[PDB]
Amino acid sequence: GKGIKKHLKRVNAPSHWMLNKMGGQYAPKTSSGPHKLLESIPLVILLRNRLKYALTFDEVKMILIQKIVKVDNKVRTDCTFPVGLMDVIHITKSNEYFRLLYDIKGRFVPHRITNEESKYKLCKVKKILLRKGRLSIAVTHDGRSIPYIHPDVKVNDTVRLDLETGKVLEHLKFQVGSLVMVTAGHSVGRVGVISSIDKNMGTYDIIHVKDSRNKVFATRLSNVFVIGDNTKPYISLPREKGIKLDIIEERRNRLKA
Amino acid sequence: DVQHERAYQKQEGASFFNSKRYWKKVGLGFATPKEAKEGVYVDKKCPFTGNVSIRGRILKGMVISNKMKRTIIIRRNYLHYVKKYNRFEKRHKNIPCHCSPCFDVKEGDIVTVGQCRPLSKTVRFNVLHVEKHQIFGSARKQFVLF
Amino acid sequence: RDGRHKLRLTGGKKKIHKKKRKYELGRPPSNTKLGSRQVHVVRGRGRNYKYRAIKLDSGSFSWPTFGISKNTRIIDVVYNASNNELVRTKTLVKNCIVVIDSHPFTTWYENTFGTTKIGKSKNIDPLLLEQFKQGRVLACISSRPGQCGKADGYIIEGDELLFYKRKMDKRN
RNA sequence: AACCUGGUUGAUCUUGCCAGUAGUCAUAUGCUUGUCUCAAAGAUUAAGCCAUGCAAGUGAAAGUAUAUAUAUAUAUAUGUAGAAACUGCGAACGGCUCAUUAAAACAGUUAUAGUCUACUUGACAUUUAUAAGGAUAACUACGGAAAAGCUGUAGCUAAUACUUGCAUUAUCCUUUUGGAUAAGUAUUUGUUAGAAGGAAUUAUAACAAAGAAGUAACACGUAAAGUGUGUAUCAAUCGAGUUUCUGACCUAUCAGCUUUUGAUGUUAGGGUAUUGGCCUAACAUGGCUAUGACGGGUAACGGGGAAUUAGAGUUCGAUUCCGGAGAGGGAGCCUGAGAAAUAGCUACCACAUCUAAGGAAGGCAGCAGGCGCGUAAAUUACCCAAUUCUAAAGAAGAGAGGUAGUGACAAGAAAUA
RNA sequence: UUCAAAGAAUCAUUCUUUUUAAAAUCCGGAUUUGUUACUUUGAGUAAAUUAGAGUGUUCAAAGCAAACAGUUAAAGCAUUGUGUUUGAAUACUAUAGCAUGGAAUAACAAAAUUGAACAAGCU
RNA sequence: CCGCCCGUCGCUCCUACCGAUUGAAAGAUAUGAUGAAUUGUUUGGACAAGAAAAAUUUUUUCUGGAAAAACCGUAAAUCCUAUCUUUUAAAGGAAGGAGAAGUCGUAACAAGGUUUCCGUAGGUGAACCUGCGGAAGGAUCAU
Ligand SMILES: [Mg+2]
Ligand SMILES: [Mg+2]
Ligand SMILES: [Mg+2]
Ligand SMILES: [Mg+2]
Ligand SMILES: [Mg+2]
Ligand SMILES: [Mg+2]
Ligand SMILES: [Mg+2]
Ligand SMILES: [Mg+2]
Ligand SMILES: [Mg+2]
Ligand SMILES: [Mg+2]
Ligand SMILES: [Mg+2]
Ligand SMILES: [Mg+2]
Ligand SMILES: [Mg+2]
Ligand SMILES: [Mg+2]
Ligand SMILES: [Mg+2]
Ligand SMILES: [Mg+2]
Ligand SMILES: [Mg+2]
Ligand SMILES: [Mg+2]
Ligand SMILES: [Mg+2]
Ligand SMILES: [Mg+2]
Ligand SMILES: [Mg+2]
Ligand SMILES: [Mg+2]
Ligand SMILES: [Mg+2]
Ligand SMILES: [Mg+2]
Ligand SMILES: [Mg+2]
């Protein structure tokens, strides 16, 4: 007939799933949801390939059936629910809290995290709609609509967003020296300060992001996620702290162990 | 004579009766000419005066024709590299563009055109800025790398 | 039917390699007429219903000068810049000039101030006034009745009105 | 491993071909073959034809059970199952093949300020009620037909099927209390006013008119008051359609093509989900072309890639992924968020099966399997365990998929001392 | 059509710093100046294949795993309980498109039967 | 040099060409004719639910609605041409290549016994001959 595609082939699966070529013909195909399949990750993968709590899809399903895994604090029983960049996972029985982050490679790690910090999540606004009764609503990368957002919030900036209640805490403008994480090409794990934004007329607004080794790298503004003010990040970053080393340096590090 | 059709050529987005003629800016630093702001002429597919927003590609060409009504042809001349011979070769492509009578354009004149929606069977572009230029052979034959 | 099957601009036959994909749908024209109201529903793409008016009369007509509107029977079609066939057949489309039973506007005027919210100061044309005197006034249609299912329109004014009169002009 | 030898002569040096030489995820076939690993395999000929079987269903709190069974607690109460069917969701994915198709498709690159988008997510609503209206299935009885996934009648009865249909917020005065004015989501028209985006006829706000659909007459018993099902708009998402630029093989023994039959444009419309000669009408006379138009050929699906190369390149790419297309041939529809669907339907053509001759159904380029064609290609196997999908979503299905079987296609290791 | 010049390091050469005109901009000091080709950096791209890093699949073709400590505990770290370290890099993804540093080489644009720059005056 | 060899003429084999035959065949478009099915609209109105009257029947109005029909519009298919492409037959004709020590000459290679060769025209069993103007690849780098 011809409509949408329900299946995903295991080689056509996006690399940072890190699936096998063997070990299956297909991949899980993230449900539609709050994240873009190419930059998400289904819950199945998390449960089975990352934490390794499950050996199989079946086990994951079973786990889900006990209403014990929460993603952003409300439960999910959909095995192929997409988790995505910043989202806190609360596996209830272990009393583990994860937050998904990026590695210095493209790969999702589940970070491990405290009760206290778990209660919020960072969310970058994308669009800021006006709706009926001249009320503004931000729309986050979490595919979530924040209504009655504080007026000073502008199109690219992140927002520290509470989970227990839908309301926001604080917001961090997209400034010239704002601690930033990346979430797309090459420099994906990378975490920097920002030197400069280009602001091209018709095109993508390219930005340059100085690291803490002072290695500058550029990136589209699209795929940059504000994470702090110049001093401190508002989230716990992984062990590497977004310092994508050179290849040689990495090898040296590996050797020294 | 402004009203030449069987219909009344109005100008949507004008607002005649109430309020304190209609043109817009089109952006990308292309200055709306005097002839659009002044100078009545109605055009549904003028970038400035009408209701088409230019967006997507902008590419300079060089007009070959004015023969169509409010519509122009522009050959882009360019160089297709052939890796076998590590050499280039002149190649071309005739983009039809909508004009709008703000621009008086004789042949051989350089233009730049923005994209815009499909305006007709082939015209997907309209001319935003017309450099003058002079030509001596046929525009057909002028290569201007661009 | 919205699709290819057409020469290539160079005038070369596009050898077709594709049936007709339903999303290239060209469902056939509702030649909507005068009469008592009668409208069908055609089911466009994502259950997006659209209202094929096939007979009409009581469209919403506006009076732009004063920026108001009223529902009136429309009593005749008198011009169609598309083609005269349509006008002969009395078919309503999105730029048909038609005649409104124009008592309502007059009544409204009377109610408001005088006899033939309020930024009044403009106070009517001569031609328009004359038209009103006979009861029945020329007016464009502005909805696309075939899509929207309403003969919504507006009263033709000053320069445009004059032009339409000229077009109409009788003479021989 | 950036390689060359033999062949014109009586001998010689060239040119020059022929021959050898190696490789081929490149087929065949000949002889031969003890292990193990890995594993292509009816593409090439006939997108030729097909016997039989199977390949899409679905119910573990949660629409509908006096078919029915059954267990507790005092003839009732709860319950627990439940064939059947109605409803819902799915069947548009997958799988197969490569016939078409040479600026088409496809690849990258835009665009959608020109659109649609079910499920999923998040926001979140507007002009008799201690609970409404029929009428339908399964079923009972009576039937018919050789036969078919045939259905007739009469009688019932449900539903989350179908159909009705019950304060508060914003603007002004008083000290959180008491009055005044309003009060439709998309959508459409007219009139204006104008936190983004490079750019707005954008968001939005007001006025004048219309105006769908909706806002629980539903089902569990849950969590630390919750869930399922449904629902208007918005956004996200899974996408889709269009679309910009650039990019293709052979042929000039194809040089002029396109235009009454939309060719090129303008206007107005119609149509579309939206743009558009997409279609209609009216008006221009355009548009493409020696930088190869238009034809013709391709033993052409495109690309990612494959082989072979020192480096260039040359050939191949039916074939693991992405895209396109097609389900004998065209064409046409219904349903639906999505089909111009083919294990949907209508029709014709071409094949063809059963028939009691009245009619009836049928479409392997799904999996096996068979005939044919051929130089040329495997089992009518076992299973849902893994990988996934669908479902009323652990618990069911799945020839999707996997596991073996055949297998000297290839590939690797390795006896015969 | 701006050629050049001078100083410091190194083993005649290499890499670095500084200035030598004119116009606009900024509180005597300090900082912008044709277009495109070309080139350099990026950005953005599916993986499978390819190159390539790691990893004794017994080797290898592979695969994307693994390694480590123990006749069953130490050690760590957690406030009796909890294995730990990790890996699945990187490059290739045109000839076009995107942004980008550019001094050379190329084009083209600017330029006299006359072309524009200022100071004054008048509208 | 008793070398080499050239062409006709026979004979056998194979290849492709021309070929009357409106040759044939399949396929492809293009036109036209008829035109199944069918979206849409229009007409219809078997009937199923209302309203009107009498004691279940009668007459009239409003709703939804099947068959059937008409008109555009998609448009299969069949037939008729036309054109093109592709294989394919054919008496005869006329080439080519191969073969066999066959016939007739001696064209060329030596000043090859008329130097050769070119273009052109006519001739002739056949190689070839001849005319005209060229060339040396001449048998002359020379008075
Ligand atoms: Mg299909
Ligand atoms: Mg050879
Ligand atoms: Mg053994
Ligand atoms: Mg076959
Ligand atoms: Mg196959
Ligand atoms: Mg359930
Ligand atoms: Mg059942
Ligand atoms: Mg498919
Ligand atoms: Mg319902
Ligand atoms: Mg026309
Ligand atoms: Mg083919
Ligand atoms: Mg292929
Ligand atoms: Mg083939
Ligand atoms: Mg077949
Ligand atoms: Mg079909
Ligand atoms: Mg089948
Ligand atoms: Mg069929
Ligand atoms: Mg088969
Ligand atoms: Mg074989
Ligand atoms: Mg399973
Ligand atoms: Mg002599
Ligand atoms: Mg002789
Ligand atoms: Mg002689
Ligand atoms: Mg003689
Ligand atoms: Mg003679």
Determine contact, residues C92/C98, Cβ cutoff 8 Å.
yes
Q: What value does the CA radius of gyration of chain A take, rounded to a whole number of Å?
A: 19
Start-to-end CA distance of chain A, whole Å, equals: 57
Q: Do A92 and A154 fall within a single domain?
A: no
Q: Do A191 and A161 fall within a single domain?
A: no
Q: Helix, strand, or coil here: C42?
A: strand
Task: Write the CB contacts of C158 (distance below 8 Å, at least 6 apart in sequence).
Answer: C125
Name all protein residues with C-beta less than 7 A from any atom of nucleic acid chain F.
C 1, 27-28, 30, 38, 40, 52, 54-55
Using alpha carbons only, give the angle B32, B33, B34 rounded to the nearest 5 degrees.
125
Domain for residue A136, yes or no?
Answer: yes
The type of residue at A37 is: L
Interhelix angle C126-134/C159-168, rounded to 10 degrees, is 60
Q: Do A52 and A98 fall within a single domain?
A: yes
CATH number where A89 lies? 3.10.290.10
Q: Provide the CA C91 to C1' D55 distance, Å, integer.
A: 55
Question: What residue numbers bound the domain in which A64 lies?
Answer: 1-116
As given in the structure block, the two tokens for residue A30 are 């993230």
Task: Write the CB contacts of C118 (distance below 8 Å, at least 6 apart in sequence).
Answer: C112
Closest CA to C137 of C66, C83, C62, C42: C62
Distance CA A235, CA A66 (A): 29
CATH number where A190 lies? 2.30.30.30
- Tokens 């010239």 sit on residue: A176
Q: What are chain B's domains? A: 1-146 (2.40.50.1000)
As given in the structure block, the two tokens for residue B49 are 């005066």
Q: Do A108 and A73 fall within a single domain?
A: yes
Domain for residue A142, yes or no?
Answer: yes
Binding-site positions of A for Mg(2+) read: 58
Determine contact, residues B26/B32, Cβ cutoff 8 Å.
yes
CB pairs B-C closer than 8 Å: 22
Question: What residue numbers bound the domain in which C72 lies?
Answer: 27-172
Cα B66 to Cα B40, B108, B130, B138, B142: the distances in Å are: 21, 10, 13, 14, 17
Using alpha carbons only, give the angle B97, B100, B102 rounded to the nearest 5 degrees.
130
Q: Provide the CA C116 to C1' D211 distance, Å, integer.
A: 31
The experimental method, as deposited, was cryo-EM
Which ligand is located closest to the Cα atom of residue A3?
A: 8
Pick from A116, A139, A161: which residue ends a domain? A116
Cα A237 to Cα A33, B2, B52: the distances in Å are: 25, 67, 47
Q: Do A15 and A109 fall within a single domain?
A: yes
Domain for residue C59, yes or no?
Answer: yes
The nearest CA of chain B is from the CA of A199 a distance in Å of 13
Which residues on C lie below 8 Å from B6 (Cβ)?
81, 167
- Tokens 């519509």 sit on residue: B71
Pick from A101, A116, A131: which residue ends a domain? A116
What is the resolution in angstroms? Answer: 3.2
CATH number where A167 lies? 2.40.50.740
Provide the domain count of chain A.
Answer: 3
The nearest CA of chain B is from the CA of A201 a distance in Å of 6
Distance CA C138, CA A195 (A): 65
- Tokens 């999105």 sit on residue: C94
Q: Tell the burial category of C147 from Cβ atoms under 10 Å away from its Cβ (0-12, 13-18, 19+).
A: middle
Nucleotide E42's nearest residue (CA vs C1') is A218
The type of residue at B112 is: T
Domain for residue C1, yes or no?
Answer: no
Q: Do A96 and A164 fall within a single domain?
A: no
Distance CA C88, CA C82 (A): 12
For residue A198, give the H/E element and its range: none
Determine contact, residues C137/C103, Cβ cutoff 8 Å.
no
The answer to whether A203 contacts chain B (CB < 8 Å) is no
